Amino acid sequence: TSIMAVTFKDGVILGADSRTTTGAYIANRVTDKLTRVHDKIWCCRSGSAADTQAIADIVQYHLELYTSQYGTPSTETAASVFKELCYENKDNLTAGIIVAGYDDKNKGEVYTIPLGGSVHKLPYAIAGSGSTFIYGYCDKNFRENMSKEETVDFIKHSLSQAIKWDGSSGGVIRMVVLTAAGVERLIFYPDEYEQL
Amino acid sequence: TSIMAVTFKDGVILGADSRTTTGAYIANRVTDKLTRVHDKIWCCRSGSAADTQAIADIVQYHLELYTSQYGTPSTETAASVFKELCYENKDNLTAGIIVAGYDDKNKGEVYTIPLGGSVHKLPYAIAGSGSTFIYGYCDKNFRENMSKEETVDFIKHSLSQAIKWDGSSGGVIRMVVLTAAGVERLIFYPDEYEQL
Amino acid sequence: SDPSSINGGIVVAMTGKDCVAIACDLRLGSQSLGVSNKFEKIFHYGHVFLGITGLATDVTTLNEMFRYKTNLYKLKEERAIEPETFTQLVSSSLYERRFGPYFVGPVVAGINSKSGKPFIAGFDLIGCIDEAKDFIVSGTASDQLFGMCESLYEPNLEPEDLFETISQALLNAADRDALSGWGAVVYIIKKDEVVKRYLKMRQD
Amino acid sequence: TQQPIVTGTSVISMKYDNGVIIAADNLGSYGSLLRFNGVERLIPVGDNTVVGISGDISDMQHIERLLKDLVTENAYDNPLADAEEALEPSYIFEYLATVMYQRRSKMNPLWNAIIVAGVQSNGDQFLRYVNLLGVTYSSPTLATGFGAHMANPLLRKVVDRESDIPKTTVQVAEEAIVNAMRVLYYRDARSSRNFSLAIIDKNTGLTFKKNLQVENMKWDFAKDIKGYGTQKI
Amino acid sequence: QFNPYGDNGGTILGIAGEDFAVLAGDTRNITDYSINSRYEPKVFDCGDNIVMSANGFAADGDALVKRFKNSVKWYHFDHNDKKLSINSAARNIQHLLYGKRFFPYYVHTIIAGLDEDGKGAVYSFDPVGSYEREQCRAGGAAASLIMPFLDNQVNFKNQYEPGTNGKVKKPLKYLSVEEVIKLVRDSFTSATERHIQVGDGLEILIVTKDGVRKEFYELKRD
Amino acid sequence: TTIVGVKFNNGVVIAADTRSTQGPIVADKNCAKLHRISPKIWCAGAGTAADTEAVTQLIGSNIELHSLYTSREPRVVSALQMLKQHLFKYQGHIGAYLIVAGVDPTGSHLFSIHAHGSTDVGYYLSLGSGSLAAMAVLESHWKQDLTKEEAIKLASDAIQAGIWNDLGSGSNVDVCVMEIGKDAEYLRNYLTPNVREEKQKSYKFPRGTTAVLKESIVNICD
Amino acid sequence: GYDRALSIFSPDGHIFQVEYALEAVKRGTCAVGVKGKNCVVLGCERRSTLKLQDTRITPSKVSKIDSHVVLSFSGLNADSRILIEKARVEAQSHRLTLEDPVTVEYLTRYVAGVQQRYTQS
Amino acid sequence: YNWX
Amino acid sequence: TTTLAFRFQGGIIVAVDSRATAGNWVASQTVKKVIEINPFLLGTMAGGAADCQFWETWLGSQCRLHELREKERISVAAASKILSNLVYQYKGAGLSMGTMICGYTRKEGPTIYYVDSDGTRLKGDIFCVGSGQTFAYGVLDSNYKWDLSVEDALYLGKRSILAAAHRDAYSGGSVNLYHVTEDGWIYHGNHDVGELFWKVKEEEGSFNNVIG
Amino acid sequence: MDIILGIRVQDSVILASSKAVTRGISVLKDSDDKTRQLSPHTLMSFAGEAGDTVQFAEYIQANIQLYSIREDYELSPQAVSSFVRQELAKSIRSRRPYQVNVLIGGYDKKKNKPELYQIDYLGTKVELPYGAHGYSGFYTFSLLDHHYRPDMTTEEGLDLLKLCVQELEKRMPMDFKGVIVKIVDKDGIRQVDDFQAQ
Amino acid sequence: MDIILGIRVQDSVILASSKAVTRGISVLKDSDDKTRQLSPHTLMSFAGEAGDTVQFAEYIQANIQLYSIREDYELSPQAVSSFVRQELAKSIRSRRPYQVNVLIGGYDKKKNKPELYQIDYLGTKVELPYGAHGYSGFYTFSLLDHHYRPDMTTEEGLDLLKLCVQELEKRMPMDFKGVIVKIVDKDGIRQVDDFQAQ
Ligand SMILES: [Mg+2]
Ligand SMILES: [Mg+2]
Ligand SMILES: [Mg+2]
Ligand SMILES: [Mg+2]
Secondary structure, X not given: OOEEEEEOOOOEEEEEXXXXXXXXXXXXXXXXXXXXXXXXXXXXXXXXXXXXXXXXXXXXXXXXXXXXXXXXXXXXXXXXXXXXXXXXXXXXXOEEEEXXXXXOOOEEEEEEEXXXXXXXXXXXXXXXXXXXXXXXXXXXXXXXXXXHHHHHHHHHHHHHHHHHHOOOOOOOEEEEEEEOOEEEEEEEOHHHHOOO | OOEEEEEOOOEEEEEEOOOEEEOOEEEEOOOOOEEEEEOOEEEEEEEOHHHHHHHHHHHHHHXXXXXXXXXXXXXXXXXXXXXXXXXXXXXXXXXXXXXXXXXOOOEEEXXXXXXXXXXEEEXXXXXXXXXXXXXXXXXXXXXXXXXXXXXXXHHHHHHHHHHHHEOOOOOOEEEEEEXXXXXXXXXXXXXXXXXX | OOHHHOOOOEEEEEEXXXXXXXXXXXXXXXXXXXXXXXXXXXXXXXXXXXXXXXXXXXXXXXXXXXXXXXXHHHHHHOOOOOHHHHHHHHHHHHHOOOOOOOXXXXXXXEEOOXXXXXXXXXEOOOOOEEEOXXXXXXXXXXXXXXXXXXXXXXXXXXXXXXXXXXXHHHHHHHHOEOOOOOOEEEXXXXXXXEEXXXXXXXXX | OOOOOEEEOOOXXXXXXXXXXXXXXXXXXEOOEXXXXXXXXXXXXXXXXXXXXEEEHHHHHHHHHHHHHHHHHHHOOOOOOOOOOOOOHHHHHHHHHHHHHHHHHOOOOOXXXXXXXXXXXXXXXXXXXXXXXXOEXXXXXXXOHHHHHHHHHHHOOOOOOHHHHHHOOHHHHXXXXXXXXXXXXXXXXXXXXXXXXXXXXXXXXXXXXXXXXXXXXXXXXXXXXXXXXXXXX | OOOOOOOOOOEEEEEEEOOEEEEEEEOOEEEOOEEEEOOOOOEEEOOOOOEEEEEEOHHHHHHHHHHHHHHHXXXXXXXXXXXXXXXXXXXXXXXXXXXXXXXXXXXXXXXEEEOOOOOEEEEEEOOOOOEEEEOEEEEEOOHHHXXXXXXXXXXXXOOEOOOOOOOOXXXXXXXXXXXXXXXXXXXXXXXXXXXXXXXXXXXXXXXXXXXXXXXEEEOOOO | OOEEEEEEOOEEEEEEOOOEEEOOEEEEOOOOOEEEEEOOXXXXXXXXXXXXXXXXXXXXXXXXXXXXXXXXXXXXXXXXXXXXXXHHHOOOOOOEEEEEEEEXXXXXEEEEEEOOOEEEEOOEEXXXXXXXXXHHHHHHHOOOOOOHHHHHHXXXXXXXXXXXXXXXXXXXXXXXXXXXXXXXXXXXXXXXXXXXXOOOOOOOOOOOOOOEEEEEEOOOOO | OOOOOOOOOOOOOOOHHHHHHHHHHHHOOOEEEEEOOOOEEEEEOOOOOOOOXXXXXXXXXXXXXXOOEEEOOOOOHHHHHHHXXXXXXXXXXXXXXXXXXXXXXXHHHHHHHHHHHOOOO | XXXX | OOEEEEEEOOEEEEEEOOOEEEOOEEEEOOOOOEEEEEOOEEEEOOEOHHHHHHHHHHHXXXXXXXXXXXXXXXXXXXXXHHHHHXXXXXXXXXXXXXXXXXXXXXXXEEEEEEEEOOOOEEEEOEEEEOOOHHHHHHHHHHHOOOOOOHHHHHHHHHHHHHHHHHHEOOOOOEEEXXXXXXXXXXXXXXXXXXXXXXXXHHHHOOOOOOOO | OOOEEEEEOOOOEXXXXXXXXXEOOEEXXXXXXXXXXXXXXXXXXXXXXXXXXXXXHHHHHHHHHHHHHHHOOOOOHXXXXXXXXXXXXXXXXXXXXXXXXXXXXXXXXXXXXXXXXXXXXXXXXXXXXXXEOHHHHHHHHHHHHHHOOOOOOHHHHHHHHHHHHHHHXXXXXXXXXXXXXXXXXXXXXXXXXXXXXX | OOOEEEEXXXXXXXXXXXXXXEEOOEEEEOOOOOEEEEEOOXXXXXXXXXXXXXXXXXXXXXXXXXXXXXXXXXXXXXXXXXXXXXXXXXXXXXXXXXXXXXXXXXXXXXXXXXXXXXXXXXXEEEEOOEXXXXXXXXXXXXXXXXHOOOOOOHHHHHHHHHHHHHHHHHHOOEOOOOEEEEEEEOOEEEXXXXXXXX
């Protein structure tokens, strides 16, 4: 699995591949690892499928209920819920999650919760087995306050590499754009990303 | 340990960090992982310090005796030696080595012998714990037939990164240049490579 | 399962003023069972003494071994072997089996016929020589013995006095060790003479 | 029953005539991969106490929340919050200590080594350590993980025994600490260059320094070294 | 896997004279090979003229002490400031300890003071409650070293009266407080020489009808 | 064990503590950790006591011979290669961690050898359980162009670091100095900062204290 | 959950529910027992409000608590059964742990204590 | 063996 | 540890060593291995010191309660079964104790029961328990006769321990003797094996292989 | 393990049981009665782990004596055993199973016929002419298979057991110090005080 | 393990050894002679693992008879034993150590005095008045320690053993089917055909 979230001028972009394996067999080549927990707060899933799906569903609830009672939820909160679930149930979970969202007051924000159950806010984050291979590229090509077009590229490249090297990753690249104007679903096929 | 070898117009360049560790302790911070096996044939050492030093020492002999009898050895040969050792004694060794040399007929050539004992010839090769983090950058920034000045850079960056993410690596960067004009000893300190 | 502890036993030796002493207990058992109370652990080859704690069969063997080796030495050199020397022989003889040691802990004491300075030394199961100009211990009650010694000892004691000292250290240390005791012997050494005395002690 | 994941290395500290000093880098290692580079491991509690934590980070973040709690809950029905009934290091320590031990006894420990450093109401310096085992100790210098082995030896050359405390000055102390940090950068493969440091003086109060870096490093010699023995070039 | 225990080394010792009792312990605290502190007391005063030490695993050590001190507190409350006799403090601790018979306090503990008839006394415990009143006892790392010495210089074991053809034991005279301290210091210096865990310092708590006195001597810090 | 080596302007020096230990009990309060390989090639070692001595002699021997057969003064790199190939041969079972240095026709030299057979070179090194302590000091006070006297302090300071802060090390400090044109000097017990304070009492037992059952003399000469 | 205090005290110091139970006794058939020098006897009258019973089975007024101890009562036949069973059990629970059948005072002190409990629970 |  | 208790004419005999060990370590030579339950009941210790000391001191309490509860002295059969049943509750938890419960009651006569952490309870006449049991059993069986005199009997035990102490490295220190009659129990000294062995050797003439 | 045997003749049931209690290295008692009278015409013998053995048998005793009282009646063997099987089968999936095997034999005063039941620690029950537990059966069954007959007089049975015990004494590693025999018939239960030789 | 006992009186040495070979579940033989005559004035009894036991004894027999011939002389016990110790001590560090314990008793026609040597599988030798191997010693020693005397007639010894065997037959878990006793003295070696009762 190869996933990352990047914050930019207009807001934020999450991207991931689409491969779920059970060993070295490809169970699902079209998986959507970008899950919605709210109109404008999403997450990228890495680790055990089940553990992740379950954790996510439980957060969509906790937020849906938050909403009804107190309006639109902040991202710091969306994270807190995740952290809580992951940290509190550490012995039985193997899920590393990246939360990304868009607020009118805070623009874009990215939080990452790694296996331990810690929460980290940062300009960008990557995770998934395939991420070992791009700590280099990314730290090297990432500039703060990029444009949508620029960011989709950065992401498109970083991951294409990750897919190149890690066999636990492949399929297609998926991205989701979070901005004032809305929510956009972007997809990229092999024939494009491979030769770059 | 992070090491790599890159071939270019004028010849080839070997580069490595300078950290040998025992568990999490830094035993030696100025180690030389670039070992000579002949006037114009060198290698990069990663893995067990014992196993590598030994394997090199045995090669130097094997080639020095080769010379006496049959003149300056080709690199394909320097490699076959290593292969023979690494493959034949696989159960007792944990050493991955990269061999780099310069001939007047073949220019620069790079071979890599990974834990298994297979030999691989390629434009460039990287290895060691810290290599995991640059398959990306490198595959993205390497261009064939670069100039010396360009290569030292490519190499300086790739490793500087590896040193950043992998703690089994650090210290200083060492490079060795192999061309018709001779043999040059390059070294690079922290205060320079860290902020690039 | 700890070979060094099946049989049990203790040995100690101390230096005095122009004299040295070495002693040991007479127990020989198997785990909890006491079997023999006449297992002397101090052997002598000429004017050099060596006591051996540890596995009984090895004690026996090594003893036999050094008789042999010391005998040839005297023939080949037409002179009786000296401590300083004998020690080195012991060390090498043990390390010779560095990867499958004799589970023992030899202790050596005697005097140089030529120079007169008293000499004592001990080793771990593989030959590391422990040279100390004061006292050496070995056996299941090593911890105890050390304790006794380090407290009781003072430099330059006379034959009559040193005897008291070593005896107590043995005796007392033995009494706090389940695997040691059942008797005890003490050797007092002087350039010309050597006396062997047996002690009265608990039999439990 | 657990195994730490994201971790933070050494924490060093020593006390001096007018207070205490403590420091720790800003790193969170995910095993051998030096993952996070902007981690503050020095947690201030009020204006008279700093708690430094090494070990598992997730748990640290918890001990963070626990503290902010301790703070709030003390102000409650306490008119003397910002004065005579404010939290004292001894309180903060004894609590944490209590917690750590309860957790080891329940077999679900907080994988940490924590040094609580500060000054009391009456002025006395305070420095004590508690780790995942509820083991508690105090000494003129304290440290966790590697620092244990390397920092202590250095810092102890300044304050060998209690009597040396009233003889050591901030400048001296701070130099020592910084150094230890440097050395640690040389040897700890899990350390980082960017660190943090803070002092707690019975007069100036609390001073906290962020974004510190190691300087005055000696690396030039590495040029005269080649091969591993017989190599000449 | 998480191992819930540690070993801070250390060593302690208690001797009881006709009308006083002593309890000492080194002041070093270790972990594997490093030294945690050269001065961390482990012999405490719990009120009611009772000194006590729990040597073994520090944490478990500090705990017991806490639980006991507190017990004493509640004793007074629940019994009109009645003074807790040592023989009683003993039985209490047996209960504290055995309370955890299946997750023991990894400590060898000793306490000392005066009994009802005013004579001095000492009791030592198994890390799970076996208790007995004894003349003297050493415990911890160097217990194996020092115990023998005591059996000798205190209970006069194996010593005999000169010239009696080994048929008369040295009469059991009783050590003066001053003479007792001598033994302690020596027992410690000797311990320091052969035990890497022992060293740094010696803190001695002394007990008499007049209260509780403390004495401190330096040791080899190597 | 704490051993170090420091190179200086026209020579090299090495040092070490003197505590030998079986587990946590000091076995030799002043055992020698410096070994003479050849007159001007000295080696220092940590690990299993036996192996540091053995591998040192065995090579000192094979070297001595080698020299005679070549009518030349020995070379460090020789001792080195000799040591390493042997250790490596033994897959690490020979617990010898050695710091080897000396002077020979080619100049001065300093190296280190780990029991698995890997070598390192540098201007200062240390090894042993006290490794970290000293190394701290070294990294704290070293500089290039050290004189004979500045270096000796340096190497000394470093050992002291080990002694004080490492239970596995202690007692005295041994130093050896090898300069380019002079004979080598072996300074055994350069420092003795751990002397035993006079004991408090003398246990000189009145004679007769011990009970004897049988008494005899022994026959030595033939 | 039901725990209302039914046996409480009233202004004059009597516990109604208890005193009332007594009255229930007064309505049950009589029963008697008297002891000799080497034996004891128990007698009882049979309720004749409804007649045409089968003696063979009907709970005999005298029940065996153990091969050596009996119990008879006057009161709500039903209540007796509970008392008897609780008693028979303690009869074995005692043999089993003391290796000796119950003395009559004990058995009694048991049954009674059982009764007392029900007057303040 | 001895450490040583 | 070697403990023994046996039955005859003038009552019951009980003797035990006084050594406790932590492996090879002699933790103590001055251990009381006989719990004075109450003026008429006695228990012996073998197995873990604490487990024994604690649970017997405890038995003492459950006994005192029974007395107040029925104004009658508790039987040994009962006093034993209490401990027994207790111990069986904790079965499998790691308790290690082998003990004898000895007493004289108007109802049962003199009686002894074996009770161990395994949960076995046995009524018997002679019993030895401990690492050194075998050695004592030896001496007993051969010299036991129901017609023994209290003077003789006390000796037979003292000796039987002595036998065991000599051989079994885990036993020894000193011997604590006890005699049981309806008027309660009577102590018969703490004999240091240090001084006792020799005396016996000389007078009886045995332990000849020893030299002295 | 210890020895437990049973044999049902025409008008009775005989149970034999080793008289020894061994522990680790020593034989602690040479006169153990490994049996309990459940009800005046029902006897149960047992063999198994140390405590569980007695503990279990005494429990069944209580629980049966209790019924006998509550009802002024005596349960038939087919019933007592069934109860016992349920109690055992109940515990096998318990936290700490009773590790006991029992042989139960009684006389059915109502059917006026004798009966013997074998049940192992798992609650395996089965009615049989003769039976045994543990290793014992291994030597004895052959003998019984051979020399047994339904219309056997009681005397004929005691001789058969003797023949059995003899074999066991001849070929069995451990010394069980002889047996204790008991006969269950219309007149109740009686112990044969003469089996050390007959 | 089997039973091996020995006791040296004033004018001889007596050896007692159980007569049973047990295999897993059965007792295969009730009449084993666990001993071999090394030389006309020396006997060795043995106990240990299934096969090593005889193999080792017969080997020692051979190597000793051989010496007896090559020199027209009989080796002293102190020697025969020392020989045996070395053979054992040799094997302990071999591919498959002989797992046998032996008792050796002989009469020294030269010193005119009897001797008994005990040596365990590791080559641990020691001279003793009486000895035993395995667990047997656990029960007997106390007796011997007690009822033993250097100036004992031969008759006094056999009774002593009898008293020993007795203790064993009473307190030992496994039935060893009795013993076979043999005495070694100036006139040679003889087997006491009467010990099933004396
Ligand atoms: Mg792919
Ligand atoms: Mg004993
Ligand atoms: Mg009181
Ligand atoms: Mg010390």
